[PDB]
Amino acid sequence: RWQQRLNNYARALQQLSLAVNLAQTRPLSDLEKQGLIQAFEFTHELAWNVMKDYFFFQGNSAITGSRDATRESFNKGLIKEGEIWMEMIKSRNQTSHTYNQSVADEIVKNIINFYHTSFQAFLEKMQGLK
């Protein structure tokens, strides 16, 4: 059920948002930065599964993974910022290298400056769809 996936996406995003707000109030420790990255990862995993579950509900069983799901979501208007959602997939592919502080800082910057807003917009869109 795509609505159950959406409810879990909402929960995960709530945790990500608490971390983003914290980072707004003060600098994050190195450990907290790693945690923000992990929350981004479980929120994005939920998001593209919401996409795939929703298109399955619509009758599209051809979508396989996150790139398929993101491309169909952009094509059908579930997301507007196709570029940012593609960048998220690239960021996920960098996860194993965040023990380098430059990589961690770059991913954190993208999460705060771009991904959180896009996650919130996708939540609002999918909630409006049911």
Residue 108 has, within 13 A of its CA and on its CB side, a CA count of: 25
Q: Per CB under 5 A, does 38 bind Mg ion?
A: yes
What distance in Å separates the CA atoms of residue 28 and residue 78, rounded to the nearest whole number? 32
Q: What is the DSSP string of 59-86?
A: T-----SHHHHHHHHHHHTS-S-HHHHH
Q: Which range binds Mg ion by CB under 5 A, 3-11, 37-45, 46-54, 99-107?
A: 37-45
Residue 70 CB, shortest distance to Mg ion, in Å, is 19
Q: Using CB under 8 A, list all residues that contact its own copies.
A: 8, 11-12, 15, 18-19, 22, 29-39, 41-43, 45-46, 48, 54-69, 76-78, 88-89, 92-93, 95-99, 129
Q: Using CB under 5 A, list all residues that contact Mg ion.
A: 38, 41
